[PDB]
Every structure is written in C-alpha cells, then in structure tokens.
Design a protein around this ligand. Sequence first.
Ligand code: HEM
Length: 153
Amino acid sequence: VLSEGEWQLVLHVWAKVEADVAGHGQDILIRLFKSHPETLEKFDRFKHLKTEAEMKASEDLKKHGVTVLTALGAILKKKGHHEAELKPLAQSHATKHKIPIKYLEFISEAIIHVLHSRHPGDFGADAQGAMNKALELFRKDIAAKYKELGYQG
Ligand code: HEM
C-alpha cells in the first residue's frame, strides 16, 4: 500500500499534469508508440501513423491521450480504493482490446519518463518512487482481474 505521504506526492504532481492533459497525453502515447512499436499495432485507428511528426499532428491521437490521462487521474485520486473504476477497464482491455499486462508496464514507464521531462522540480526521486508504487498497485490490481478472466499477462 502507499502511505498518505506518498499519495500526496503522487496527487501533487498529477495536479500539474492536469494543467495540460492534452500535451501530456500526446507525449506519453507517442513515447509508448516509439519505444515499443508493437503497441501501436493494437490501434486500428492509429496504424497509419508512421512518423513522430504525423503522430504529433493527429488530433484524434491527442484526444486518446486525454482519454487515458482522465481515466488514470480518476483512479489515482481514489488512492487505492479504485475497485469500481478499475473493473470495467480490466474487462475491456483483457477481453476486448486484448492488451497484455506487459503493455501496461510499458505505458507506466512512458508516464514516468514524460513527468520527469515536464516537471523536473516537482518530480524528484521521492516523487518518482511514490509514482512508481501507485502505477504498480494499478497493474497489480488489473493483473488480478485478468487472471480471473483467463488472461493473466
Ligand atoms: C494507463 C492505462 C490505460 C488506461 C487508463 C486505458 C484507458 C482506456 C479507456 C478509458 C478506454 C476506452 C473505453 C474502453 O474501451 O474501455 C481505452 C480503450 C482502448 N485502449 Fe486503453 N487504456 C490504458 C492502456 C492501454 C494500452 C497500454 C493499450 C495498448 C497498448 C490500450 C489500448 C486501448 C484500445 C485498443 C482501446 C480502444 C480504442 C478505440 O476505441 O479505438 N490501452 N483505454
């Protein structure tokens, strides 16, 4: 579990992310798509984007960045009591989109990378450690729903 002190660290940087969800959302997806190109293959709707410049120019891509950060932010603010928000998410991603847990690990790393880039001041080692623990909790809880459904990993 995260301590209260750790959740405050998490939510204080997140409040900065909320100042520009679209910009953060965009960078994180692009970072994910560039680092692990196999992830882009899950999106029929983005499978035509070949360069970073095309990715950066996609308004639909931007809109998906905001969708992802918005749902994640809702989860973070529950500070661990995210059972209701997490369930519908695990179910669609497991059975519908067919996203392996590993890819969740990949987007978590993309999030951490971007935050460090846009908030070097509010994102010190202690905050990076708290953020890591929060995303690990999220993955751990999803993984468990996946396992129940016959999809573990
Ligand atoms: C931080 C973790 C992520 C969050 C919170 C999340 C959030 C969401 C939201 C809310 C939905 C749309 C509603 C729904 O279908 O359930 C969505 C749809 C979907 N997500 Fe994720 N997502 C996450 C990670 C991933 C990753 C890592 C992948 C692929 C690498 C993925 C692929 C998709 C797919 C393919 C759809 C359908 C998009 C479409 O309608 O074309 N998601 N995700």
